[PDB]
Design a protein around this ligand. Sequence first.
Ligand code: 1RJ
Length: 307
Amino acid sequence: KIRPECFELLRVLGKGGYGKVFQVRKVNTGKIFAMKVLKKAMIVRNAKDTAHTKAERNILEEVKHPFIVDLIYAFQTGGKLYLILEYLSGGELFMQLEREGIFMEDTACFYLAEISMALGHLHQKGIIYRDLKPENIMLNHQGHVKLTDFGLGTIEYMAPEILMRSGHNRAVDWWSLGALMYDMLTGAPPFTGENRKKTIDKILKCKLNLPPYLTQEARDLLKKLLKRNAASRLGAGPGDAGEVQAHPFFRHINWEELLARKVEPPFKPLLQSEEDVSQFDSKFTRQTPVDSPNQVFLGFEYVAPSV
Ligand SMILES: CNC[C@@H](Nc1ncnc2c(C(N)=O)cccc12)c1cccc(F)c1
């Protein structure tokens, strides 16, 4: 049986509006895991919210893919829900950008390539990732990507139709990718505003500024992704991911190798222990790890067939 007590809290890894993520140890004894904690009390009052929260618990169980994060255990108490994920000691791709600054082309390429297979798998399953801001991506302990966010921030990477809530499809993912790619290559997201509205209005007017040092392939791709008309974006077509991956910017990518994780990451986190936490923001990792003190979430319980 699985209850909160099977695990001891080692660190705080992140803090969301409806909850936290703890690094924990299973007391698989000794194995480290990330424990994501959701307060039901904030969730069950909003239909659209419990939906997103159950969508998340289904998707994580259903999908198994090298570049999406795995659900090990899941479980609930009176007021909390508990997800136990593999622990991704590479941290967020956000912090990887901070760490190494603007990425070189071949570096940017690798991460985008992995991310593109991820999106491609998801789409086949009818799943849209919506938002591809670098904090919604992490790196496992070997330095490869893991999409990690299917539950319920900044908006700069979201596409127009999404923001204006005018109705969309999987192509918003391909817009969001070109904004990610921009940010990796330039160090900023393509449309930023002095504040919120400035930024949305800037995203709508959608006037792309390409820096002079971008290769021709980099520019071309970026142009075809960051198109206002979602139909016109590369990857909008029936090809989806294979459409984007075919573009020349990716001409060095041997895909079946990449998926096998046979390609060396551009940067290897070198960790010193299983729960080395050096790849995480210390704003969080310093805090004292403490879990603050009808049911529709029936049957939340999960145990991966693996473990
Ligand atoms: C990355 N987006 C933020 C997300 N944090 C994580 N999500 C899944 N796994 C993680 C792991 C890990 N499994 O290794 C390690 C550290 C953080 C996360 C999130 C969302 C809502 C409320 C939260 F508190 C946190």
